[PDB]
């Protein structure tokens, strides 16, 4: 399989191969099989069960509170996402799946901040919305019992060429020309902090009065930015549905327009509303871009509604499609229908849900499969729509890691758009084997302890950390009979100084240099060692009754003894089983005749 065929070692590359591979770290390792293989194959070789590493990916649950049923409960107790904390662990190239549930709870607290354009064409609307506080509370009591309402207004930056700077009295009465009075120019003023006292919205609105801008584009985006990042003055609640109603009847300015007026410094995510409730940096900071607006609306969890007259509805639809979590509604000139507009905007806004991935590391990737209305499933999507509010939906999240990150305790969050109920993910990667500690670091089996159980260097690392390749004075350490002589006497081949002598059908070879064998001995009188010995490295070892190199001479004396009892009858000398008769006149095998 792949695990064996890749021939990796050290238990770390073995893990890096595939999630399925496993490693064995026995002290009594069986030889001839790779230490890297899938768990079953290691168990086939009977690697000790506690000596196999085989880490396995998983996904736990740390907080699994149930989804709330009503929003009017204790603020901390409301829970719209479950599970709430998850810790998952996976290998350098594996993937794991887990699910998340979201339920748009009913009767949730609601915060409405009515940000209103105050160009001269807005005077009729300013008249028509003098009862909006009470009307809106009366209608919303059906949907939410913890309502709040705010207010704020914008015209445009107070600087030429946007505002009338002459005649000199015009700057203190922009409507001076048409023979009527109106407020001087202003960028953005914070009128009413969010409050539960519905009636006071009506009181505060009646004190307002329109102004006059020279050109059609309004500076609303600069107002939205401050209404988003000045949370402490605006008074956004942590546990509530933030609505930012935006009313206008004209196109809008955008970043880099401030160059015409001498404004080049780019906008930044900071609050500059002074103690007088007027945005102070209006005349020294450019407009904010849609990217920055989207970032700050995501961070502060604001749902932004575009309520605009029918002449510029399409423009703001095309703008909204670039800002996640927004909608559009058509105002009359008199603004007579803003109440119904906001009610239906809230319903539509919470009739959908989409998931944000906040701080995913670059080494991870996520894919979503969404269970949706009526238990149907839609692949690939990370959102759903058509919900009735109160219902519940879930998503199947599948995550994969890319290699082994250098640090293995990162974390990130997943969160629906517009809500703080999120799932916090703790991720860890099992790159390292447990045996890398206390087991592998060193072992005397390799270079007298100078090798991790091996991983030594030149001089030993040739094989088993006991072979040399730096010097090569070679791998044939004394394989030849003598210095400079042929390796293994050319009877085979050697590695690490040991000759693998070849076998033959007519004999076999032995010795470090293959210098000995069991067949190269001499024959005499028809058979090896005369049948009176056995072969050993080309020499005969003779029996007790025989001597000589061929074992050709007998050591016995009973063949020389004569019937008189004397060897050779005392007439000669016995040699190799026969008598050399010295005495003249005597004959016979033993000179006995």
């Amino acid at each position: 399989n792949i695990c064996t065929t890749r021939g990796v070692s050290s238990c770390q590359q073995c893990l890096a191969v595939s999630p399925m591979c496993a490693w064995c770290s026995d002290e009594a390792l069986p030889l001839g099989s790779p230490r890297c293989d899938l768990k079953e194959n290691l168990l086939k070789d009977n690697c000790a069960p506690e000596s196999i590493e085989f880490p396995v990916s998983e996904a736990r649950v740390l907080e699994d509170r149930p989804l709330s049923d009503k929003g009017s409960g204790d603020s901390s107790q409301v829970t719209q996402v479950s599970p709430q904390r998850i810790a998952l662990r996976l290998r350098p190239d594996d993937s794991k799946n887990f699910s998340i549930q979201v339920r748009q709870v009913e009767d949730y607290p609601v915060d409405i901040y009515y940000l209103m354009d105050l160009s001269y064409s807005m005077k009729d609307d300013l008249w028509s919305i003098q009862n909006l506080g009470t009307k809106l509370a009366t209608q919303m009591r059906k949907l939410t019992s913890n309502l709040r309402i705010g207010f704020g207004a914008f015209v445009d930056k107070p600087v030429s060429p946007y505002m009338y700077i002459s005649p000199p009295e015009a700057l203190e009465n922009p409507c001076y020309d048409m023979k009527t009075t109106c407020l001087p120019m202003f960028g953005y003023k914070h009128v009413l902090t969010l409050t539960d006292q519905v009636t006071r919205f009506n009181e505060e609105v009646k004190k307002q009065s329109v102004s006059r801008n020279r050109d059609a584009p309004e500076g609303g985006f600069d107002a939205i930015m401050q209404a988003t990042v000045c949370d402490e003055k605006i008074g956004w609640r942590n546990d509530a549905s933030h609505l930012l109603v935006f009313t206008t009847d004209a196109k809008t300015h955008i970043a880099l327009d401030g160059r015409l007026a001498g404004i080049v410094q780019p906008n930044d995510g900071q609050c500059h509303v002074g103690s007088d409730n007027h945005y102070s940096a209006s005349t020294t900071m450019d407009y904010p871009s849609l990217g920055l607006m989207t970032e700050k609306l995501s961070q502060k969890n604001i749902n932004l509604i575009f309520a605009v007259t029918e002449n510029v509805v399409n423009l703001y639809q095309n703008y909204s499609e670039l800002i996640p979590g927004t909608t559009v509604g058509v105002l009359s000139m008199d603004s007579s229908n803003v109440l119904q507009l906001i009610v239906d905007a809230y319903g539509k806004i919470r009739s959908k849900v989409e998931l944000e991935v906040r701080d995913l590391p670059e080494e991870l990737s996520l894919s979503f499969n969404a269970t949706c209305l009526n238990n149907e499933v839609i692949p690939g999507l990370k959102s759903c729509m058509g919900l009735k509010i109160g219902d519940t939906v879930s998503f199947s999240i599948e995550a994969k890691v890319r290699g082994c990150p250098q640090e293995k305790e990162k974390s990130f969050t997943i969160k629906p758009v517009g809500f703080k109920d999120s799932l916090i993910v703790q991720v860890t990667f099992d790159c390292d084997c447990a045996c890398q500690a206390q087991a592998e670091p060193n072992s005397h089996r390799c270079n007298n302890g100078n090798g991790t159980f091996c991983r030594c260097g030149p001089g030993w690392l040739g094989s088993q950390c006991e072979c040399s390749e730096e010097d090569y004075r070679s791998q044939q350490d004394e394989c030849s009979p003598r210095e400079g002589q042929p390796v293994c006497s050319q009877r085979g081949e050697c590695l690490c100084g040991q000759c693998v002598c070849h076998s033959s059908d007519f004999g076999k070879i032995t010795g470090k240099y293959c210098e000995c064998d069991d067949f190269s001995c001499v024959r005499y009188k028809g058979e090896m060692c005369s049948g009176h010995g056995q072969c050993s490295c080309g020499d005969c070892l003779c029996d007790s009754d025989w001597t000589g190199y061929y074992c050709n001479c007998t050591t016995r004396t009973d063949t020389c003894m004569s019937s008189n009892g004397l060897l050779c009858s005392g007439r000669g000398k016995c040699e190799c089983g026969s008598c050399v008769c010295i005495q003249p006149g005597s004959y016979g095998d033993t000179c006995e005749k």
Binding site: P167, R214, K251, L260, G262, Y319, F506
Partner: protein, 928 residues
């Protein structure tokens, strides 16, 4: 890729003055010197009563780095009647846009408020000052009688300017006609001549200008930025302008015909609010004569891998085609919120490589968002999509983003060294930086190995200081360098090369240089900038095989070089640079091996010859046979060589002649298979090319069989090669022989007798043994000393019977041993008895008795013997005739081997004779 980021030249102006907002070069044709123009739209001036009216500074280049103002104006606001001011110069942003050409400097104040002729008022028409030579004039095209927002009241003319090839000004006002914007183009010659200070609403006759349009187009900001190029082939530059807010804020760019100001093309943006048109440029980027258009969209929001939109900034590059159509590619930014594309500035040919280059800026990127500038190179098929360099701002924000790279200007050479330089503005910190372009050198290097295929044995070289001869080869290196610009006359290259690099990782070293400089050679080359390759070479020799073991991996030499910049920098310290794509290293490898060719199998040629130690062998005993053999392989190497001898039934293997130091100590063994019997010996592996060997083999011959005449053997040599793996069979023979070395022997007992016979008495006739005399025994034997047997043989014995008519020795009986029968010519025991100097007596002197014997088959060592018991006849010696005589009795015998069983071999008869004697003497001497 060649801008000198090390030690640029830095210029700074009054703090908080936006110094460096707009930058440009100054090229006074009447003077040798060059200067930089830097705009400070918020610097305070000496104009009476003007607060932050702005100014333009002229900054030197040589040895001072000083900056000084340009006296475009020195007067406050003009009055209309007595105190009603005509104009308001405070906060006018003078110097916000600067352009220069030859000796004409055009600076504009986009925020100049004008009052008006018809009524007390305040409108920002905008104005420009044009300095040409010593003359200075004011150009205010939008300061006209189009009274208010309906016309040119809010034109803000001078927001963006540019000079044309035809010495005609192009000027944009984004605020005219309800901010529909306006472009206005007037000839320089008329501006300088039609100017009259006492008339404010000056009318120009040769003016080209756009005109208001329907209501839908309000707030388009036409003229936000402008560039000039020729886009219809008529030869006179046309006008390019970006309308960032048009088409529901999508953004567009307008190409207006430079003649009669008509509309040619309109580029359309893709994403709302991207501000498509913030900055534009036009230059030839791909070698066509046609100008290629670049458009920036700093706020373009790209869709990331996760599906999120993110602000990165985008630049659109359009390549003009001969038919006038455009092929467009879109290039995105590299980090979020960095506003890539805020500024585009063609650089000319930054490396003189034949295609112009372009620089694009992201003034809010990098670490701590200090700003970054990217550099791209034009290729023959468009812009190179990967930047070849990156400039990073070194100044941290004081109270405002540094905006390094908000405005740049290129395509000018302050050095006059052939390569254009580049200015960069960092107005957030009130600084402007000048980057010089380093000369570019293209280097071609050559490497040669002689020979490419390396046979190991080609010993040619001699080691210096010794007589040693070493295999070697020739290696040569070359380099060639030149560049398009002001470069020094001679360049010092430091080139080094070491042998077989990819295996010097601690392993054995293998090849050496002629001076054994640790396979490492480093040398200086003072190459003159020119066309010569200036090759050089040295001879490298392999060390002895006993010192290294790698014969498989080809020797892979390695060479590299690096220029000595400190010597190649001019007097101003600017250092050359090598071409981006030129590799500074190269290597080559050769095939050092002997491998029998492509098929990897050698073709041997095997032969053998033999000589016989035993010239002839005698049948009848085991004979050790020694054959002396010489083995040779005249061909290529023979793998697994062996020496083979096939043997017959009548012989068996013994071993080798090991004690003979002149012969090989061969390993040998004996085999038998399928009735085939052979002797095998080992000759090593391989048997090398042309090698010769000698050895001796021992056989045992058991030739006791009778019908064979010679012994025959066959020798051969074989290997495991696929080619010619067997030598011709070499048969040899030794002739058999017959040799029955038969001899005849005899003995007597006793050897002597003494007269008179003790205890003997004379009698008329004998009846017992004691009556005749002392007993004497004679023995004769027929013995064989040779191995060959004989089937038949004959033996003969002679015996002295009677001397002087009287018996000498008397026989009683004869006995036989071995395979013989015997008979006597004289009756044995005729009486049938109850069973001075020594003279010689014998049959020659006395009557002879003879015994003849017949013999059968016998072998070596075996013998047959005849025994005789006899009595010494006493009368012959005690007679008076011999009382004074001593005698030695003589007998003799002979034999013949008459037949042999080996009839097939040549045979000869074998015969001989011998004698046996007994002595008789007088122990007691009688009277003489």
């Amino acid at each position: 890729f060649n801008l000198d980021v090390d030690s640029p030249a830095e210029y700074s102006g009054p703090e908080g003055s936006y110094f460096g907002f707009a930058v440009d070069f100054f090229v006074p044709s009447a003077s040798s010197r060059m200067f930089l123009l830097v705009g400070a739209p918020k610097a305070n001036t000496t104009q009476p009563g003007i607060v932050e009216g702005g100014q333009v500074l002229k900054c030197d280049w040589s040895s001072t780095r000083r900056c000084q103002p340009i006296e475009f104006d020195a007067t406050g606001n003009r009055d209309y009647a007595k105190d009603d001011p005509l104009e308001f110069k405070s906060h006018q942003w003078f110097g916000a846009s600067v352009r220069s050409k030859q000796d004409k400097i055009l600076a504009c104040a986009p925020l100049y408020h004008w009052r008006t002729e018809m009524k007390q008022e305040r409108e920002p028409v905008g104005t420009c000052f044009l300095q040409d030579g010593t003359k200075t004039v004011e150009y205010a095209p939008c300061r006209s009688q189009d009274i208010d927002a309906d016309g040119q009241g809010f034109c803000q003319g001078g927001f963006s300017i540019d000079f044309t090839k035809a010495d005609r000004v192009l000027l944009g006002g984004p605020g005219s006609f309800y901010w529909q914007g306006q472009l206005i183009s007037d000839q320089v010659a008329e501006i300088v001549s039609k100017y009259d200070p006492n008339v404010y609403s000056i009318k120009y006759n040769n003016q080209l200008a756009t005109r208001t349009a329907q209501a839908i187009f309000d707030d388009s900001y036409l003229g936000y930025s402008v560039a000039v190029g020729d886009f219809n082939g008529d030869g006179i530059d046309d006008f390019v302008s970006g309308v960032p807010r048009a088409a529901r804020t999508l953004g567009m760019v307008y190409i207006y015909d430079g003649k009669n100001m008509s509309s040619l093309y309109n580029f359309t943006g893709e994403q709302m609010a991207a501000y498509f048109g913030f900055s534009v440029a036009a230059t030839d980027i791909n070698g066509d004569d046609y100008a290629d258009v670049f458009i920036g969209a700093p706020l373009f929001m790209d869709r990331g891998s996760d599906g999120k939109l993110q602000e990165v900034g985008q630049v659109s590059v359009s390549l003009q085609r001969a038919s006038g159509d455009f092929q467009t590619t879109k290039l995105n930014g590299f980090e979020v919120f960095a506003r890539f594309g805020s500024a585009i500035a063609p650089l000319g040919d930054l490396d003189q490589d034949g295609f112009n280059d372009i620089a694009i800026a992201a003034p809010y990127g990098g670490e701590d968002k200090k700003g970054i500038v990217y550099i791209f190179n034009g290729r023959s098929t468009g812009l190179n999509a990967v930047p070849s360099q990156i400039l990073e701002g070194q100044w941290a924000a004081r109270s405002m983003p540094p905006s390094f790279g908000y405005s740049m200007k290129g395509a000018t050479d302050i050095d006059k060294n052939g390569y254009p330089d580049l200015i960069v503005g960092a107005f957030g910190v009130d600084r402007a930086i000048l980057y010089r372009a380093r000369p570019v050198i293209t280097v071609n290097a050559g490497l040669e190995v002689y020979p490419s295929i390396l046979n190991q044995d080609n010993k040619t070289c001699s080691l210096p200081g010794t007589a040693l001869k070493v295999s070697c080869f020739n290696v040569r290196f070359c380099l060639k360098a030149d560049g398009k610009g002001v470069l020094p006359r001679k360049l010092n290259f430091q080139v080094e090369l070491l042998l077989d690099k990819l295996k010097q990782k601690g392993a054995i070293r293998r090849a050496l240089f002629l001076y054994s400089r640790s396979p490492s050679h480093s040398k200086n080359m003072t190459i003159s900038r020119g066309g010569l390759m200036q090759c050089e070479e040295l001879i490298a020799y392999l060390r002895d095989e006993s010192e290294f073991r790698d014969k498989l991996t080809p020797i892979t030499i390695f060479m590299e070089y690096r220029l000595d910049y400190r010597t190649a920098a001019d007097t101003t310290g600017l250092q050359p640079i090598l071409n981006q794509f030129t590799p500074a290293n190269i290597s080559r490898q050769a095939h050092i091996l002997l491998d029998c060719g492509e098929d990897n199998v050698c073709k041997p040629k095997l032969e053998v010859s033999v000589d016989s130690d035993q010239k002839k062998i005698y049948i009848g005993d085991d004979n050790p046979l020694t054959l002396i053999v010489k083995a040779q392989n005249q061909g290529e190497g023979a793998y697994e060589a062996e020496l083979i001898v096939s043997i017959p039934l009548q012989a068996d293997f013994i071993g080798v002649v090991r004690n003979n130091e002149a012969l090989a100590r061969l390993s040998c063994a004996f085999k038998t298979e399928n009735q085939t019997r052979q002797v095998v010996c080992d000759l090593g592996n391989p048997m090398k090319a042309g090698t010769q060997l000698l050895a001796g083999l021992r056989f045992s011959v058991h030739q006791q069989s009778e019908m064979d005449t010679s012994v025959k053997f066959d020798l051969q040599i074989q290997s495991s090669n696929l080619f010619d793996k067997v030598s011709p069979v070499v048969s040899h023979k030794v002739d058999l022989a017959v040799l029955a070395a038969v001899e005849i022997r005899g003995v007597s007992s006793p050897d002597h007798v003494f007269l008179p016979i003790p205890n003997w008495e004379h009698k008329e006739n004998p009846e017992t043994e004691e009556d005749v005399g002392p007993v004497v025994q004679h023995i004769y034997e027929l013995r064989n000393n040779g191995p060959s047997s004989f089937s038949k043989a004959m033996l003969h014995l002679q015996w002295p019977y009677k001397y002087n008519n009287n018996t000498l020795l008397y026989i009683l009986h004869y006995d036989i041993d071995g395979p013989m029968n015997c008979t006597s010519d004289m009756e044995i025991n005729p009486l049938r008895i109850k069973i001075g100097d020594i003279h010689t007596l014998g049959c020659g002197v006395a009557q002879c008795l003879k015994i003849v014997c017949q013999v059968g088959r016998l072998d070596r060592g075996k013998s047959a013997i005849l025994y005789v018991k006899s009595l010494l006849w006493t009368e012959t010696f005690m007679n008076k005739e011999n009382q004074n005589h001593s005698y030695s009795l003589k007998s003799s015998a002979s034999f013949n081997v008459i037949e042999f069983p080996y009839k097939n071999l040549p045979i000869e008869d074998i015969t001989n004779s011998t004698l046996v004697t007994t002595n008789v003497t007088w122990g007691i001497q009688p009277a003489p």
